[PDB]
């Protein structure tokens, strides 16, 4: 029970990787705020409660500062000081560089990059006064480039930059800020693809299988623990050796 | 005369690194569009003309798609197909993570990241049809983190991500896309800093001095030449060995 | 008890980081072989036994293939199949590039690089047949350069290269191979340094203090567990955010 | 004529990449020492002389300190102070990690890593007193791992480590030390492979073709010039965007 008596916000935790992260944190004893724009977040929180954990859904669009301020206020009123923030919420609006619309650019930056910043900021305001904390950002293997992902790669590389900046500003205050880059993970987004394509992606992964949400969760749980106090500003790939 | 009969757009070329880049490109025979939001860009273009080069100022705010579309239209009407794009325009609005205003976040992302995207997009639309081209993005040593630069580091890491994405999309079309990360360069932006700070930055540079605009220019000119056809998706530091 | 019923070899585990790693692995239930060239390794093993763990010292100079073959034979006779190898043993013989003697070059490469290879090889021979395993190499922040460390940086960068190579060869066989780069850790090697130097290294560490052996140990224990099955070929810095 | 009145040693310049580098340096006006263990080096030097350049073959096995000392003595007696050292000489003795013989390990480290060190050392002794110089090391895309190349990847990552170390020690003395990582280059070593295999390797290169020796040469020539004085400790890939 490595995270007993700790409070964690996981953004985008209604489903997929976020939900897997929330399960693992809950398994290790954390009180978990499921922060999501979608109301299925209530079902995710309920699922954690049914397994014996303490959990609460808070509706939040991370791209809106006032909603993010409200998320942190409410979270702390309910479960006390936020020890752990996991910035997992994100979207794709893929297109080739020459075709990408301004709207599809704007929206991906707004959620993945700005939204992540807004949450990091709220965590930082609080954590720097308490002298403790964990911020863990979910980036992507696409941060060093991927076809069709000018907006997404920009946003996720941006997240890595902020991660490293925040490490420098907050490390002396007892806070760690790290990034995880999932490789190819089995979720709803990756499942709905022709089976021939799936096999091509698998053949790019030296380990020979797609990861699960819980593989990302295990790495988050480790970075969130006291044993990872000296890991700061890192980018850890969770992709079975896969070089995108 | 490595760039004879080539047309280059250099954004942010009214002063500083951009102007140095434009000088070197002009020295190697390029026709140079000085693209800048500031009207001093006319004086910069005039200075190149007085030295014997062909040059033209076009007023442009790279954050506005319609102005960027106009920049490329006019550039091509005047000097023919754009062979080389140098995305140098950028700004700082520094602040610690816990203090950074939403406006200061927005503006830096809008210029450095989105602006760079808009220009890359216009270049890509054209260059992929011609089967030739050079895109060179000026990032920063701050892309892997720097105190006070949550917004700036996000934006510049983002530029690195897009650079690598564009390399993957465009390399087979005979186009290279690379990034230069200047370290500490002597310009108007770095000169207007307390003298105590300047000395701290100098002591971080193994070479023992601040670089000049022309040092960045020389690297741009090399990447722009036919001899660098096989360099693609690279991040080259021009910082006298400086590890930020 | 994440490593119950697992057998681990930790090279260089008589003292310092190696001994800390061995403690943490033992705490999580592993049977630990203390492999070291120094006979104080018997005391380290005894200390683990006195705390309730199973542990055995085996004398070994990792630079000698025949001794490494003997280490693995004996280890397996005593505690059964080796599930985990931690290549921690290493030395410094620092000197500026222009002064470094051939003997001091030879010895550092022989231990840090070749020794690590020999042990990796023995682990690989066995692990690839069993379809399971963990190899964790202790590299150094010096792998991307450090004054006075031509031989050491060469050796540790070399270790990173082998780590990534081995990930590619072994991942499909259910084995992970990862590297940890400690930053500045408080051990016998770092304590025996002029006090003026110590203070300079501390001022480079954003966290504000030198790490302990157990900080490296916690990261090893995580990578050795089933929860890190999808982390492969990584280089994880354990240095309180320190950029050397 | 960017390198007029400069003296360059290129190791391994009897054929392949080394010979291409020597051609480009000679084209830009350098006096070139072809340093090689093979006597075909005399023919390579003769070929440069027939094109109008000044060139000299010196027999040298870079793994032997006394021969390297002799190489630098003779080179300077013939063509005056060595301004540029290109450490290109290297070998492969590939094998899987579990099969690699001790002899094949030893020989690759001895040539690629130790040999490169010995030459760097001789250059450094001289260049640090003169207050000027260029060292350019040919590494490989394999430095971040490649199947069957435990020894080669170790050796080439090692070269990158030394490169960065030497940058830190020598930058303040007006010397730059950089590394080039060729991707997939058309030489005698790469030509002797079944044509079906070659096409698979080509399809992994975003640029869509294999590089030539002269592509590496162009990058060396640039780094060797005065225009690259502010590039130091860099690893530049010359591989058409190819991520190994
Ligand atoms: N699927 C994969 O294999 C990989 C995923 N990632 C990243 O990991 C993270 C999780 O991805 P998945 O589970 O695959 O995605 P998903 O789409 O299954 O889940 C995303 C969740 O975030 C929420 N969300 C979206 N926009 C939001 C906003 N503005 N405010 C609050 N919540 C919002 C959604 O409602 C949803 O519940 C994302 O950041 C994704 O980009 C990175 C690499 C690979
Ligand atoms: N000076 C340094 O040490 C470093 C500079 N950089 C980057 O290099 C680039 C140039 O830097 P400096 O010359 O120091 O900057 P500077 O501030 O001296 O000049 C920047 C130029 O860019 C133009 N510009 C700004 N926003 C624009 C827009 N939206 N549209 C069109 N033009 C615009 C400005 O009008 C100005 O002419 C910037 O992107 C900067 O972030 C990166 C690392 C270090
Ligand atoms: N302390 C620090 O801040 C850092 C340490 N490291 C690395 O961490 C590892 C451990 O370092 P410390 O515990 O600080 O050093 P240490 O010198 O205190 O302990 C080294 C141990 O390894 C053993 N060893 C040396 N050569 C050997 C050989 N040929 N065969 C078997 N055993 C051998 C020694 O007998 C000793 O027991 C080393 O590889 C070192 O390079 C890396 C970065 C920072
Ligand atoms: N061919 C390729 O695609 C790639 C080559 N490289 C590296 O680039 C460099 C040149 O490669 P190639 O031209 O293909 O090699 P090559 O095998 O065609 O030529 C290498 C030259 O180095 C010489 N040499 C070998 N050992 C020596 C020693 N101990 N002292 C002095 N000279 C010695 C040989 O006699 C030969 O003339 C090597 O370091 C190689 O590992 C790296 C990545 C890809």
Short mmCIF file of C-alpha atoms in Angstrom, two decimals, chain C residues 48-227:
data_model
loop_
_atom_site.label_atom_id
_atom_site.label_comp_id
_atom_site.label_asym_id
_atom_site.label_seq_id
_atom_site.Cartn_x
_atom_site.Cartn_y
_atom_site.Cartn_z
CA UNK C 48 21.43 -8.90 4.77
CA UNK C 49 21.21 -12.33 6.45
CA UNK C 50 21.05 -10.67 9.91
CA UNK C 51 18.03 -8.65 8.68
CA UNK C 52 16.18 -11.89 7.71
CA UNK C 53 17.01 -12.14 4.00
CA UNK C 54 18.73 -14.91 2.07
CA UNK C 55 22.09 -13.69 0.73
CA UNK C 56 25.46 -15.02 -0.42
CA UNK C 57 28.79 -13.37 -1.22
CA UNK C 58 30.65 -14.59 -4.30
CA UNK C 59 34.11 -13.20 -4.99
CA UNK C 60 34.35 -12.02 -8.59
CA UNK C 61 36.31 -9.63 -10.76
CA UNK C 62 33.80 -8.84 -13.54
CA UNK C 63 36.63 -8.06 -16.00
CA UNK C 64 37.59 -11.80 -16.09
CA UNK C 65 35.26 -13.98 -18.18
CA UNK C 66 36.15 -17.22 -16.30
CA UNK C 67 35.30 -15.61 -12.92
CA UNK C 68 32.00 -14.29 -14.32
CA UNK C 69 31.13 -17.78 -15.66
CA UNK C 70 31.92 -19.13 -12.19
CA UNK C 71 29.79 -16.41 -10.52
CA UNK C 72 26.70 -17.43 -12.53
CA UNK C 73 27.28 -21.20 -12.06
CA UNK C 74 27.64 -20.89 -8.28
CA UNK C 75 24.80 -18.38 -7.96
CA UNK C 76 22.40 -20.79 -9.68
CA UNK C 77 23.60 -23.84 -7.70
CA UNK C 78 22.90 -21.91 -4.48
CA UNK C 79 19.70 -19.92 -5.22
CA UNK C 80 18.38 -21.33 -8.52
CA UNK C 81 17.83 -19.46 -11.83
CA UNK C 82 19.03 -15.82 -11.92
CA UNK C 83 15.95 -13.67 -12.57
CA UNK C 84 17.63 -10.27 -12.06
CA UNK C 85 21.13 -8.98 -12.91
CA UNK C 86 22.19 -5.53 -11.69
CA UNK C 87 25.48 -4.41 -13.22
CA UNK C 88 26.58 -1.83 -10.68
CA UNK C 89 30.34 -2.51 -10.32
CA UNK C 90 32.49 0.31 -11.68
CA UNK C 91 35.58 2.44 -11.08
CA UNK C 92 37.00 5.89 -11.82
CA UNK C 93 40.54 6.72 -12.94
CA UNK C 94 39.97 10.34 -13.86
CA UNK C 95 42.35 12.54 -15.83
CA UNK C 96 42.13 15.28 -18.44
CA UNK C 97 42.15 14.06 -22.08
CA UNK C 98 45.67 15.31 -22.76
CA UNK C 99 47.10 13.55 -19.62
CA UNK C 100 45.20 10.24 -19.39
CA UNK C 101 47.57 7.28 -19.25
CA UNK C 102 47.04 4.20 -21.34
CA UNK C 103 46.82 2.07 -18.16
CA UNK C 104 44.11 4.26 -16.63
CA UNK C 105 42.17 4.16 -19.92
CA UNK C 106 42.54 0.37 -20.19
CA UNK C 107 41.46 -0.42 -16.62
CA UNK C 108 38.28 1.73 -16.65
CA UNK C 109 37.13 0.30 -20.00
CA UNK C 110 38.01 -3.22 -18.85
CA UNK C 111 35.87 -3.03 -15.68
CA UNK C 112 33.02 -0.65 -16.56
CA UNK C 113 32.43 -1.60 -20.17
CA UNK C 114 33.87 -5.07 -20.82
CA UNK C 115 32.96 -6.31 -17.34
CA UNK C 116 29.38 -5.16 -17.79
CA UNK C 117 29.32 -6.91 -21.21
CA UNK C 118 30.59 -10.20 -19.75
CA UNK C 119 27.89 -10.25 -17.08
CA UNK C 120 25.14 -9.20 -19.54
CA UNK C 121 26.27 -12.04 -21.81
CA UNK C 122 25.98 -14.67 -19.07
CA UNK C 123 22.55 -13.36 -18.10
CA UNK C 124 21.45 -13.29 -21.75
CA UNK C 125 22.54 -16.89 -22.47
CA UNK C 126 20.30 -18.06 -19.63
CA UNK C 127 17.43 -15.59 -19.77
CA UNK C 128 16.73 -16.02 -23.49
CA UNK C 129 16.14 -19.80 -22.95
CA UNK C 130 13.90 -19.25 -19.87
CA UNK C 131 11.73 -16.62 -21.59
CA UNK C 132 12.02 -14.20 -18.61
CA UNK C 133 14.52 -11.86 -17.00
CA UNK C 134 15.69 -8.45 -15.87
CA UNK C 135 18.98 -6.75 -16.62
CA UNK C 136 19.57 -3.35 -15.04
CA UNK C 137 22.79 -1.47 -15.76
CA UNK C 138 24.09 1.35 -13.61
CA UNK C 139 25.51 3.91 -15.99
CA UNK C 140 26.18 7.55 -14.95
CA UNK C 141 25.16 11.11 -15.68
CA UNK C 142 28.69 11.39 -17.12
CA UNK C 143 27.64 9.41 -20.25
CA UNK C 144 26.90 12.69 -22.03
CA UNK C 145 30.24 14.16 -21.00
CA UNK C 146 32.12 15.37 -17.96
CA UNK C 147 35.39 17.18 -17.38
CA UNK C 148 38.24 14.79 -16.50
CA UNK C 149 36.33 11.69 -17.53
CA UNK C 150 37.26 10.71 -21.07
CA UNK C 151 37.62 7.07 -20.00
CA UNK C 152 34.65 7.00 -17.59
CA UNK C 153 32.22 8.77 -19.96
CA UNK C 154 33.30 6.46 -22.79
CA UNK C 155 32.67 3.45 -20.62
CA UNK C 156 29.27 4.56 -19.33
CA UNK C 157 27.95 5.74 -22.72
CA UNK C 158 29.09 2.34 -23.95
CA UNK C 159 26.95 0.74 -21.28
CA UNK C 160 23.95 2.74 -22.53
CA UNK C 161 24.59 1.53 -26.10
CA UNK C 162 24.74 -2.14 -25.00
CA UNK C 163 21.62 -1.67 -22.91
CA UNK C 164 19.65 -0.54 -25.94
CA UNK C 165 21.13 -3.24 -28.16
CA UNK C 166 20.24 -5.93 -25.63
CA UNK C 167 16.68 -4.60 -25.36
CA UNK C 168 16.29 -5.11 -29.11
CA UNK C 169 17.70 -8.68 -29.00
CA UNK C 170 15.91 -9.87 -25.86
CA UNK C 171 12.59 -8.02 -25.56
CA UNK C 172 10.63 -10.61 -27.56
CA UNK C 173 11.98 -13.29 -25.18
CA UNK C 174 10.21 -11.58 -22.19
CA UNK C 175 13.40 -9.91 -20.90
CA UNK C 176 13.85 -6.21 -20.13
CA UNK C 177 17.18 -4.42 -20.25
CA UNK C 178 17.32 -0.91 -18.81
CA UNK C 179 19.88 1.57 -17.54
CA UNK C 180 19.85 3.85 -14.52
CA UNK C 181 22.08 6.95 -14.52
CA UNK C 182 22.66 8.06 -10.93
CA UNK C 183 23.33 11.78 -10.63
CA UNK C 184 25.32 12.62 -7.49
CA UNK C 185 24.90 9.97 -4.78
CA UNK C 186 26.44 10.03 -1.30
CA UNK C 187 28.80 7.00 -1.08
CA UNK C 188 32.45 6.26 -0.12
CA UNK C 189 33.61 7.31 -3.66
CA UNK C 190 31.86 10.73 -3.51
CA UNK C 191 32.63 11.39 0.21
CA UNK C 192 36.41 11.19 -0.45
CA UNK C 193 36.47 14.38 -2.52
CA UNK C 194 37.55 17.93 -1.53
CA UNK C 195 34.77 19.69 0.41
CA UNK C 196 34.86 22.67 -2.04
CA UNK C 197 34.03 20.23 -4.88
CA UNK C 198 31.17 18.57 -2.99
CA UNK C 199 29.51 22.03 -2.61
CA UNK C 200 29.78 22.69 -6.36
CA UNK C 201 28.08 19.37 -7.16
CA UNK C 202 25.29 20.10 -4.60
CA UNK C 203 24.63 23.52 -6.20
CA UNK C 204 24.05 21.75 -9.55
CA UNK C 205 21.26 19.54 -8.07
CA UNK C 206 17.83 21.22 -8.20
CA UNK C 207 16.61 19.01 -5.32
CA UNK C 208 19.34 20.62 -3.13
CA UNK C 209 20.94 17.46 -1.66
CA UNK C 210 22.95 14.41 -2.66
CA UNK C 211 20.94 11.25 -3.18
CA UNK C 212 21.28 8.06 -1.19
CA UNK C 213 22.04 4.54 -2.30
CA UNK C 214 18.42 3.55 -1.57
CA UNK C 215 17.07 6.08 -4.12
CA UNK C 216 18.85 4.11 -6.85
CA UNK C 217 17.70 0.88 -5.16
CA UNK C 218 14.02 1.85 -5.33
CA UNK C 219 14.26 2.45 -9.07
CA UNK C 220 16.06 -0.90 -9.58
CA UNK C 221 13.36 -2.69 -7.55
CA UNK C 222 10.62 -1.15 -9.67
CA UNK C 223 12.32 -2.07 -12.97
CA UNK C 224 12.90 -5.59 -11.64
CA UNK C 225 9.18 -6.11 -10.87
CA UNK C 226 6.44 -7.46 -13.18
CA UNK C 227 4.88 -3.96 -13.24
#
